[PDB]
Design a binder for this molecule. Structure first.
Ligand SMILES: O=C(O)C1=C/C(=C2\C=Nc3ccccc32)NN1
Ligand SMILES: [Mg+2]
Length: 713
């Protein structure tokens, strides 16, 4: 209820007040003009937005019928071409985007993704540009807790020594000495622009003196030594009076790594935001981060100060350069409605509002606030779930029109193309071309892209199990195809090529062991769930020369269209009944475990124990893959209707028990039919086949609004 009328728009009062009183001031944009701009952009671009969404449904309908009238890959591919799903590949080109920050064009390193509605997590992320290696090693299972090195209420010095040793070895691998090991260092000095390291006998310098990047304190006895490797900084904090430094052979207190080079503040799959009040909380946090005054009861960090090897001062950034992830093209939100009572497209709103807010981040002031995000004056929006190059061109048009409403130079709002839909994958080169002057980023993932995969080929037959999907031909070609297209479009030295998220937040040893594969595959960046994970993952960019990898990959075409189009159908008699049961339970607990927190508590990302009590931090896309898989098995009679109900009922109390220790929690068992969460989870499965491209948000947003409305009394 209660709205402000502006032309054809009926704007929720809370939103209206927030923009005028909080967002607009300092931007020198006339409030009346802004709202007219909103009304106009919305009226003009809404039909297009709708036209694209209808085109998806049409395409999917044809693909459905085709499968029902049957596999001949040659005919399939020709069909996709005929219906305008597979478009012709454009001639080679190089992107032209300008005014892009160094964090994106040149530096390879970790990238954090955080739900914007959580100010605490958002604050930590922005400050995770720099992280303590010691804390990360000590706090996680990277250092085993075995030989007397278990963690306790108090500091364990045996475990500390292992941390130190691990770090000492890292230094050896990253910034090697001409002779000897950092392990035996006793002191650090700066003699004539050159870092001397004191060993017991002799005293050496860096193998490459070029890696010596600066220091703090007196050259004769620095308080820290700054190093650089593969563009990433390493700070050795020296302090013999500290407890840790006291026992260190060279007085070293800590090793600090440049960690999360960039961060994505997320308005999409990691948050639950189903109405106007929610969007405002989200927008307000975004405002604070760009104002640079967001804080919790604690602040955002300022740049760091150093001394060049041969005297003189310099400075380095102290915050993670921020992107924002807008919602995609599909959903509407009641934050604004029309005179007929039709909700306005949420993506259109996000562009306008997140873009307005981001103006503050281009300026250091007192009306705009103290801390600056982008130094070149770009706004970095990541756009999810686009299908095909027309939808990309549409996003760029939206951005262009928003830039006019905001009075920003054209091409200010950069785009990060997420490759997570089949129709974007197979037309990827064309998608990048459609954004050739705005694009700063492409990336791959597992959850959404597989959900689309399952849904697109829904009628073709039963898919393989979810675990199996990570090793299927289509996804391996997809991963490699992404890297190839970016590099072919000239991304190396111009834009990020990213890869997916490590979801197992407690298995850091495993992450350190395996996630190295991503930069080895030429990814200039990849997702981590926490600041701690960003610090650990930063080790990989030290061990791997991403720029060299990309250069060596140049011109290769490692994935074919046939490979991309290889549908992940299961072979005959693939599974025993126990395996089927295990897969169903797996997916049902996955849905119930994530849905219960989303619907009941408005939580979009958290450590959710899986069926075997492994902690996984996933976003909403987990629902899409899980629900589509079950819907597929349901459709082709792998499982009956009884089967699915029995599983949800078995898994509900287990999820109930898994949330013990949360006072806010309300059990779903034993009264399932009275549980809005249980029903939401059941619906996502039973109606899964009929949701557009398998998306979960229509069901979810509806059930969360229903829960919130039941809670209104
Ligand atoms: O595999 C994918 O497609 C995918 C995983 C994922 C996340 C996993 N944990 C998260 C926490 C916060 C925001 C996003 C995520 N996003 N996309
Ligand atoms: Mg996604």
């Amino acid at each position: 209820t209660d709205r402000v009328s502006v032309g054809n728009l009926r704007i929720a009062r809370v939103l209206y007040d927030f923009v005028n009183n909080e967002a607009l001031p300092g931007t020198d944009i006339d409030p009346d003009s802004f709202w007219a701009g909103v009304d106009k952009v919305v009226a003009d671009l809404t039909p297009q937005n709708q036209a694209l969404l209808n085109a998806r449904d049409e395409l999917q309908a044809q693909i459905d019928k085709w499968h029902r009238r049957r596999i001949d890959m040659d005919a399939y591919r020709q069909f996709l071409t005929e219906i305008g799903y597979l478009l012709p590949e454009p001639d080679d080109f190089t992107i032209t985007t300008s005014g892009v920050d160094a964090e994106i064009t040149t530096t390879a390193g970790p990238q954090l993704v955080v739900p914007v509605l959580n100010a605490r997590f958002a604050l930590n992320a922005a400050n995770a540009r720099w992280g303590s290696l010691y804390d990360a090693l000590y706090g996680t299972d990277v250092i085993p807790e075995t030989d007397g090195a278990e963690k306790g209420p108090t500091y364990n010095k045996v475990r500390g020594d292992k941390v130190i040793a691990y770090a000492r070895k890292f230094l050896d691998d990253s910034v090697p000495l001409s002779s000897g090991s950092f392990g035996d260092a006793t002191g650090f000095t700066v003699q004539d622009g050159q870092l001397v390291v004191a060993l017991p006998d002799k005293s050496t310098g860096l193998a490459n003196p070029g890696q010596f990047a600066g220091y703090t304190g007196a050259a004769e006895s620095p308080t820290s030594v700054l190093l650089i490797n593969h563009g990433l900084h390493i700070e050795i904090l020296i302090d013999p009076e500290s407890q840790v430094g006291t026992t260190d052979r060279a007085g070293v207190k800590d090793v600090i790594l440049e960690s999360a080079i960039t961060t994505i503040m997320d308005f999409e799959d990691s948050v639950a935001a189903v109405d106007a009040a929610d969007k405002v909380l989200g927008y307000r946090n975004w405002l604070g981060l760009n104002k640079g005054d967001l804080a919790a009861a604690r602040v955002l960090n300022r740049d760091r100060n150093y001394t060049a090897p041969g005297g003189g001062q310099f400075t380095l950034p102290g915050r993670s350069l921020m992107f924002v992830r807008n919602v995609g093209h599909l959903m509407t939100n009641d934050a604004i409605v029309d005179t007929d009572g039709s909700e306005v497209f949420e993506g259109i709103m996000d562009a306008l509002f997140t873009g307005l807010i981001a103006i503050h981040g281009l300026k250091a002031s007192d009306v705009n606030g103290p801390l600056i995000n982008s130094r070149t004056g770009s706004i970095y929006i990541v756009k999810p779930k686009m299908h095909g190059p027309a939808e990309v061109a549409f996003t760029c048009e939206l951005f262009s029109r928003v830039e006019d409403v905001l009075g920003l130079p054209q091409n200010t709002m950069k785009i990060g193309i997420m490759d997570e839909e089949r129709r974007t994958t197979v037309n990827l080169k064309a998608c990048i071309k459609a954004a050739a002057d705005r694009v700063v980023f492409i990336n791959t993932g597992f959850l959404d892209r597989t959900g689309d995969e399952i849904h697109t080929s829904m009628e073709a037959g039963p898919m393989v199990r979810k675990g199996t999907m990570k090793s299927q031909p289509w996804i391996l070609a997809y991963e490699d195809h992404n890297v190839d297209a970016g590099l072919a479009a000239g991304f190396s030295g111009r834009a990020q090529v990213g890869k997916g998220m490590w979801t197992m937040t407690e298995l850091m040893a495993d992450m350190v062991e395996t996630k190295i594969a991503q930069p080895r595959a030429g990814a200039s960046t990849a997702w981590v769930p926490s600041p701690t994970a960003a610090t650990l993952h930063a080790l990989h960019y030290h061990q791997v020369d991403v720029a060299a990898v990309q250069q060596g990959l140049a011109g290769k075409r490692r994935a074919t269209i046939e490979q991309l189009l290889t549908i992940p159908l299961a072979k005959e008699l693939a599974w025993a009944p126990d395996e089927i049961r295990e897969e169903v339970d797996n997916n049902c607990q996955s849905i119930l475990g994530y849905v219960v927190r989303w619907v009941d508590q408005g939580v979009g990302a958290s450590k959710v124990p899986d069926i075997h009590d492994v902690a996984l931090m996933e976003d909403r896309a987990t629902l899409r893959i899980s629900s589509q898989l079950l819907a597929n098995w349901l459709r082709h009679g792998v499982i009956t209707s009884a089967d699915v109900r029995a599983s949800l009922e078995r898994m509900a109390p287990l999820v109930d028990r898994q949330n013990a220790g949360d006072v806010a929690y309300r059990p779903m068992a034993p009264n399932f039919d009275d549980s809005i969460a249980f029903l939401a989870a059941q619906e996502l499965i039973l109606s899964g086949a009929q949701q557009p491209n398998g998306y979960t948000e229509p069901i979810l947003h509806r059930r969360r609004r229903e829960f919130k409305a039941r809670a209104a009394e």
